[PDB]
Amino acid sequence: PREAAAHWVPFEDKANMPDNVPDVVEVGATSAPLLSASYFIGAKCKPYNDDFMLCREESQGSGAIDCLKEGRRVTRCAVSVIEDINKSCLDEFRLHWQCLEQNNHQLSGCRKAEALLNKCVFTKLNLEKKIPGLRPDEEPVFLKKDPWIKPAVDDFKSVRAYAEAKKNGTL
């Protein structure tokens, strides 16, 4: 919760899970693919994530050990979403997070690639990108036309793919 100062030295641990708890395979996506598919991880895995944090609230202070069985399932369902999005939308998911690794991982600067990614994932994986807590009479930010905050330079691959999706009639 506080960060290490004044000569911290890092250390790691040559050990294993005990036999009591089964194997769980991990998430291997880094920040730009994780930030790219964050809304679709949240759209599919909402009741699993909320049961995990509700576990953590319910049995206070035990925490780690009494919530492992649902921390299993949140990781497995997010892995399901990520390979689902790989095998359907690999090239434009890659287009999106390759836009996102420039521009400080700001979602504000990658609108023309995220329109393509949202259209693919919505027609093929049937998951929708939504911002909750947003009452009506309020436009969502990634839908608006001519925003005030444009990026410095639009990425070339995504504006080329965006124009070709215009002329195909994809989007």
């Binding site: 506080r2 960060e3 100062a5 004044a6 000569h7 911290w8």
Partner: protein, 180 residues
């Protein structure tokens, strides 16, 4: 680069001894400015990078400037550290050094026992384990939370503090004007 805190502790000792024994009154004040810099070094060292620049801005840039500004246009006599003057002081200096030092080290401890109170101040050797938890989603740094709690939970302290700043305006004026 392990012994950094120890080095700042030692250099702070040495700087205070140069403060209290100095030819010229403003040689002593420049040693105080150096002690402020050693303080800000320790504060960045422990993890408080905000406070160190607050110390350099407020203490060095306003209080030391006011102090040097006073020494310039006022006349202050000074004796220097004669040995005839001050080794009459030294036996009580030594007794009070050891007593006040041990006694300041005493109150971090909870024992019935006197020197178990003392040597738990030196039981320092264990290296704190820093864990990452992903529960915080935004850049609330320390100045943000000081601005939240000066302004919501301790808003009355901020307004009584405004009265104190008001007094720091009114008082020096009220002394030094000689109204007509």
């Amino acid at each position: 680069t392990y012994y950094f805190i120890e080095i700042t502790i030692f250099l702070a000792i040495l700087c205070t001894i140069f403060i209290i024994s100095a030819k010229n009154p403003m040689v002593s004040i420049l040693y105080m400015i150096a002690l402020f810099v050693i303080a800000a070094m320790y504060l960045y060292l422990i993890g408080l990078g905000i406070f160190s620049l607050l110390y350099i801005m407020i203490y060095i840039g306003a209080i030391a400037v006011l102090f040097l500004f006073i020494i310039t246009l006022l006349d202050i006599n000074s004796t220097e550290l004669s040995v005839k003057s001050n080794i009459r002081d030294l036996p009580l200096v030594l007794i009070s050094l050891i007593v006040l030092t041990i006694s300041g080290l005493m109150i971090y401890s909870n024992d019935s026992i006197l020197i178990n109170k003392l040597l738990e101040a030196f039981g320092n050797d264990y290296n704190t384990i820093i864990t990452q938890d992903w529960f915080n989603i935004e850049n609330t740094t320390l100045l943000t939370t000081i601005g939240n709690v000066l302004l919501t939970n301790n808003a009355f302290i901020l307004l009584v503090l405004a009265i104190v700043l008001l007094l720091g305006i009114i008082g020096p004026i009220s002394i030094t004007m000689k109204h007509k």
